Amino acid sequence: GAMDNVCQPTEFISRHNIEGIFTFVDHRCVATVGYQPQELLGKNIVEFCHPEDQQLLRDSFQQVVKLKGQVLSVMFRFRSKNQEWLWMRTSSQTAQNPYSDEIETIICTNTNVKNSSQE
Numbered sequence: 001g002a003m004d005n006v007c008q009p010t011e012f013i014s015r016h017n018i019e020g021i022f023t024f025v026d027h028r029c030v031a032t033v034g035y036q037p038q039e040l041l042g043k044n045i046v047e048f049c050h051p052e053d054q055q056l057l058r059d060s061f062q063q064v065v066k067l068k069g070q071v072l073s074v075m076f077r078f079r080s081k082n083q084e085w086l087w088m089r090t091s092s093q094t095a096q097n098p099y100s101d102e103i104e105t106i107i108c109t110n111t112n113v114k115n116s117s118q119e
Helices: 051-066
Strands: 011-016 022-025 072-079 085-093 103-109
Touching: 051 072, 051 085, 051 103
Parallel strands: none
Antiparallel strands: 011 022, 011 103, 072 085, 085 103
């Protein structure tokens, strides 16, 4: 997988509903998880998330939505376009507008990241 949308990732801001269905995905997502924003949009964020970790992912969304605004931080394995468990940290918090009723989740790549276009 060698796209040419952006330079390198770090974290991509993807909005979604409580379910995790991406109501928005920042174009960094292609450099981050290979999946273009549209390749994520309408998709359940956790569907990519490792099963055993989806419970934690959804949990976060359940907390941000419960506390309406309060940000959540959860690390999960995002099966990216490379078909690899991309460990990420989510910054889930009720989106701004008009997706206020949604949840702005900033998926940031973990592990070592300096001059690598992956993670």
